[PDB]
Ligand binder design. Sequence first.
Ligand SMILES: Oc1ccnc2ccsc12
Lengths: 296, 301
Amino acid sequence: GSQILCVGLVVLDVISLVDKYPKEDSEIRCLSQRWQRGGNASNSCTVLSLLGAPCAFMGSMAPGHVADFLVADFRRRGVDVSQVAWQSKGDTPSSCCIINNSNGNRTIVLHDTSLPDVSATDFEKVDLTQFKWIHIEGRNASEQVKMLQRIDAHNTRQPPEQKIRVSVEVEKPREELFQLFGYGDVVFVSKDVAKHLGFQSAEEALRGLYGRVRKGAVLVCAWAEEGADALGPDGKLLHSDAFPPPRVVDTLGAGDTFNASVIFSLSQGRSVQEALRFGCQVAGKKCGLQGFDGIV
Amino acid sequence: GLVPRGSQILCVGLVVLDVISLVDKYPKEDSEIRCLSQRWQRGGNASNSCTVLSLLGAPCAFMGSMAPGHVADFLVADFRRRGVDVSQVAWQSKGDTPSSCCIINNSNGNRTIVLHDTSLPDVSATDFEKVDLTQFKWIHIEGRNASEQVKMLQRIDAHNTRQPPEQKIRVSVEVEKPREELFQLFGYGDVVFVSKDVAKHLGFQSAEEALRGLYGRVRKGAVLVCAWAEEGADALGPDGKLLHSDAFPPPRVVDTLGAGDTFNASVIFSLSQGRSVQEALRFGCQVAGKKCGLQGFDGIV
Ligand SMILES: Oc1ccnc2ccsc12
């Protein structure tokens, strides 16, 4: 019971670093380029690993030269990949990512291949006893709500001493996913989802959405340079200022760095206030670097 | 493997990986969107000409810079997919194998391009010194780093100096970007290709204006060639006679990307087969026009 598990996408991020965002129908030359392992649950595994937390990724992956790269990266980072749902149909997805080196803005064109999502069945097939935490990136909702019911069940039959804690990310403003607010002890909702839904602050959002969460759970909302807020059952709003770097050069996967770091801190039994601060602290540190090398 | 003496046509230039995404609307900065479709394509002038020469039935080799890595691995597998010999590649210990990102707006046609970075060092004159030339019957050079490429051309001139004219290596040059450095390249090669774009920048309004206006810059006996899209192509040799062929536009135009490279390679092929400039011009125009109605190079046959 010593590992954290993330369940979501792994994506090849084909990255271009430019010094200003290109105007439509124009042509500019990038400063530098790199390939990076990406996808939300993949990114959080990078971060959890860098923090010293044994973790494991679980997502789909079609065999090929791309996947061979993604996997060589998972190892080397020490991410247990042994839970991957290897596909036959489809290619592994990839993104074009334009990173604006003057403000770290990152723009992403995702080629979501037909590759099929990890399912209730893939999941029903995993040894829950290895994990202290399970984080799920909201993608195939209805099919994941099932993986969530399974974990609750396993919990029921377990001494509070050894229940598996669960967190859930709703990053995309998409209906299918809104049912997912109802699971997990921790629920991450993005600024985009919040805005796409009426609210224009992290505190508004938390008041609004708290009704939708499972009894006793914490709802977390980061808001970039506004920092991040949390709201638990006690009804007290928690806040943390951001730790922006002097020069913000790369925000690609800052949100995932925040999620990972919050998860990490909580899994070490720190308070919600402490973990809020940790998340901003580490996400902010990453925004001042290209990639993840160097956040520790 | 063993390459027979004087059998291959060599093309020296750029190879680049083009990632091409088609989208609903141009992405607003800091957004996360889905393309309609995405394609990884081997690109570059000397690179495309190599593809075309293989499809035409010529043994061809590519010389360009690459750095070891997954991008290079993809480009090399694609080269090989098109029957192109890649053993002359100049492998580099520093820099990125070129890769470009292109975003095609589906609701209006616009292409927005992020060009490859400048990290990888071009093929040098000393890189090229190491090449045994006897395998080649023709050598074509995409103009890039002209001061260095001039030395390569001087080397071939030296080589040729000492051969029966039946084993002299024919040489062609392409000046396609309108930048001053390249213009000294006009002075080299038996066949000089100048692009419509370059000609326009020098202030010429037609293939005829450009050939007459620039022929001064070529070496005694050279042929200067200019293609002008749907106005066809002209050539102008040492005898002063402006040759011309009309375009062979396709039923409907589908993909013009790399049609100039298809023209260059077709002309080169034709000439290398001992056809006359007028026949080369015409052939070049046919294959290029066909390619324009085709997605990629598959059916140019
Ligand atoms: O806390 C954050 C979460 C996501 N993005 C950013 C960017 C600067 S701080 C920060």
